Amino acid sequence: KKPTFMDEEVQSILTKMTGLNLQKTFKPAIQELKPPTYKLMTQAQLEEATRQAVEAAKVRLKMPPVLEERVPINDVLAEDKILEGTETTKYVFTDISYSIPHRERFIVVREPSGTLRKASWEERDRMIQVYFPKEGRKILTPIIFKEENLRTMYSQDRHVDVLNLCFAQFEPDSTEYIKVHHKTYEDIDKRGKYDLLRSTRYFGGMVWYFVNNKKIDGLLIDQIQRDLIDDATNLVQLYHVLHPDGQSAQGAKDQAAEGINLIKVFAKTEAQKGAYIELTLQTYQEALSRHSA
Amino acid sequence: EDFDTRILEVRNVFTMTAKEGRKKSIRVLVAVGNGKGAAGFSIGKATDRMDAFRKAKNRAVHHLHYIERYEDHTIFHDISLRFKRTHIKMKKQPKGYGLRCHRAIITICRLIGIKDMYAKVSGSINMLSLTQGLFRGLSRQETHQQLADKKGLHVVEIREECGPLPIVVASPRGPLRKDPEPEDEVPDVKLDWEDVKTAQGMKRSVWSNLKRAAT
């Protein structure tokens, strides 16, 4: 079976690729500030506090699950033709029972034509927000998600902010969430701004999107330039794992491609910019020979 | 030229002399400061107001305290002092909190270079005693580096906006102390009733937290 995003090996690979830049993960936030508190710590106490901060950062960077687009809801519970034309406005009945999970709530729509149907996904999310208000979400779709504003946010290099807004507003399996995430990933790949998403929980999603679209050339180039050779090798190995039938994976299987030779094989096979990938890898090898020795 | 001069009090003082009856003079309290920690205050006595201003402002620059500012915007820690019959309670505040302090303390903090601090004055509000106690407390404050050197331990800052990230703001100059320090179950610290009342919400003064112009 082809591995899924939430598989343990893939999760570990993406966690290693993401990085754990502790300053970036806990960058100071522009909010209502309170006077800080100071503790006197020994070296062991400071190390323990740093380790606890690392654990908290790992909890914070838990990658959101990538889900396939939800199938549109099209179900008619009843067709009461007697009610046709009685009312000129739909009725949206929402089961607001507290203990029911939000994806098991029965939200129904009584149409003016007398049709009692199940609520669409958009209506479901709207009513869930109306009657169970989640912080950070709006009933009406914010105008920030329009493309004219998305391009401005990308120009301001606020891709992480865009993804945070998308996660807050839309559900992970919604059409809008997937579309916005893909647009952000495309812009990041085009402008080569991958380092923006490093040490953030969206890096795994970006890597998975690139691998599933077989355009990991730019990320590999950035990792080689940023001397993340182990991460680049992990990315190539994950690409081969998710494309066992791929020619690059077959070539890696045939030879004993264990380290940098994996990246060489990927550059020579199944890379759109393989020549430039090989050139950058050669430049890294030259720098390593120059300075390591 | 880098120093700014501010008046804090101008009093007309009279004396009983046989030769002239009631002699009149002017006593002026003047605070000077360069906006970078170095600030001072002085008293000028003169028959003419401008002469008193000149005397006090020329004498102040020879009596410049250097006030240590945390991150160049605030005091290093809370300062509770009682100079004569004037109590001054200064609270360290984060960036952007502004100067919520007595107007004289606001002026003196602007002269020093402090941009965020709280200050409550209780008891006698005598301007001279207020200024003297404020300068005494600010000069006697202990910096983070001094605390780290004194107790041989890392002084680590915990910020709510930064989450659980430990920020080592100070480290001892000499060898570090491996004693994990006493985990004091209950701190024997003399609290202030007003602070506790405000924290618990029992305080309902109609004058606290009033909207005011930028300071």
Q: How is the secondary structure organized here?
A:
The structure is cut from a larger assembly and holds chains A (293 residues) and B (215 residues).
Chain A: H1 8-18, H2 22-25, E1 37-41, H3 43-60, E2 76-79, E3 91-94, E4 107-110, E5 115-118, H4 121-131, H5 147-155, H6 159-169, H7 175-191, H8 203-212, H9 217-225, H10 229-242, H11 247-254, H12 260-268, H13 274-291
Antiparallel strand pairs in A: 2-5, 3-4, 4-5
Chain B: E1 4-17, E2 21-33, E3 38-46, H1 49-60, E4 64-66, E5 79-83, E6 86-92, E7 99-100, H2 103-112, E8 117-123, H3 127-139, H4 144-151, E9 154-158, E10 166-170, H5 193-200
Parallel strand pairs in B: 7-8
Antiparallel strand pairs in B: 1-2, 2-3, 3-4, 5-6, 6-8, 9-10
Characterize the main sheet of chain B: 4 strands, antiparallel
The gyration radius over C-alpha positions of chain B equals 21 Å
Cα-to-Cα separation, first versus last residue of chain B: 23 Å
Count every beta strand of chain A, where a strand is a DSSP E run of 2 or more residues: 5
* Helical stretch tally of chain A: 13
Distance between the termini of chain A: 44 Å
Tally of DSSP helical segments of chain B: 5
Largest sheet of chain A: 4 strands, antiparallel
Q: What percentage of the residues of chain B does DSSP assign to strands (E)?
A: 25-35%
Order of helices and strands of chain B: EEEHEEEEHEHHEEH
Largest interface: A-B, 28 and 33 residues
Main location (chain A): mitochondrion
Keywords (chain A): Acetylation, Disease variant, Mitochondrion, Phosphoprotein, Primary mitochondrial disease, Ribonucleoprotein, Ribosomal protein
Organism (chain A): Homo sapiens (Human)
GO cellular component, one term (chain A): mitochondrial small ribosomal subunit
